[PDB]
Subunit: 123 residues, 4 copies
């Protein structure tokens, strides 16, 4: 976990995120999305639960990226929830929720759901 | 947004979270869950997209809580994605993803999805 | 269950659905949405698991509505997954997935997620 | 669509489902799950929106399976929402919601979310 999480990860869409897993569960870094109403790097922050594991389970973690930087303001935020699996072919398997700011009338259609798999190799 | 987000919020399950929205999109605080394999306060970190809004839309945001503290280690993490609506009756409407660390065989059933509504009044 | 499910239900958005729960787990009926790219009634079909319950649990069920009828073709379909709780104030609590047909390039943003609560009284 | 949907499909977990897409949007068939609290074949019913497409988009569809048959009663139901893409390598990409019947107290943790990709070849 932690040490193994720190580094650069790539997903199936071509996005990249670099993260540092701190000793006490913190995750800090940047995310660069290959799709969307995103351009450049965005700040990301999250947490992971280690003290994960005498039965080779994954380490649960999650992070958030608000899609605003000095080049774009997409008025939305995405949260990724999943687990890290280390080893030869380590990966982070996730499901994400992307919410856009809407008027109350369109709040029912404000959230998209999807999944992403990240590897240390691209892809 | 930001100023309006800062404070204590309560949801329909009886959980409470106190957060500080920093000038540049950061969200930091603690979460205390009324249900689950949670006991006491857990650290939370997230982001919000302001610079939100000439058409009274909500402010998109998200945060993560790893369910580990000095009393419990639930080997899981939850991410909440939604938007803040201010005013007389301000609220944060969210959808969440709770992922538990599993063995590869049970990874298909590792994530729960739900929704929570937070108000400044309980509830 | 079954008998209790049969009838007209209304949700918080003003939609209405009438369903018949058949003896062997089938659910058939129509749905009329108050929002969206929907107009009039659409056919719905689903299933419920009864033989549900010596510990007052809910009955799990789900149904699908393809948003095409003789007035509109929204090129999308919604599935609702949840459980029925009977009694004085019976309700069906659900989470739904709305998928739109997209080109491969936009498939990552093809699905919306939300939740709806249905009651026998409106609302 | 329709004709192309009819047939046997296999997903990454080893499950199999055979379906018939009827002329007017109906989907009927059986599902056999390789995981879970499932054993044998279960009935499935759903809908698809064709009249799908001068820009090679997918056909939106969804179906439900209640996990009860003459060998098992798992007190749960799963709904799959996604789209069919035909061609050389046709597939059905989905996201699913599995809800279990719970007591009111555990209703917050009643639904699991995941995703499955089905192909005509296994896998
Ligand atoms: O890498 C990405 N994953 C997807 N989810 C999201 O929010 N934007 C897309 N980019
Ligand atoms: O407040 C809570 N909301 C629910 N989601 C979650 O992760 N635990 C529960 N507690
Ligand atoms: O009643 C409705 N619920 C929401 N989900 C959906 O698919 N359309 C909306 N209408
Ligand atoms: O094929 C399967 N997909 C998964 N979702 C589900 O409900 N059970 C599992 N089996």
């Amino acid at each position: 976990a932690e040490a193994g999480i720190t580094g650069t990860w790539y997903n199936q869409l071509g996005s990249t995120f670099i993260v540092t897993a701190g000793a006490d569960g913190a995750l800090t870094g940047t995310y660069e999305s290959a799709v969307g109403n995103a351009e450049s790097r965005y700040v990301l922050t999250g947490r992971y639960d280690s003290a994960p594991a005498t039965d080779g389970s994954g380490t649960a973690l999650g992070w958030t990226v608000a899609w605003k930087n000095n080049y774009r303001n997409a008025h939305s935020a995405t949260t990724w929830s999943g687990q890290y699996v280390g080893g030869a072919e380590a990966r982070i398997n996730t499901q994400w929720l992307l919410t856009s700011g809407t008027t109350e009338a369109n709040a029912w259609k404000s959230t998209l759901v999807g999944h992403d798999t990240f590897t240390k190799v691209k892809p």
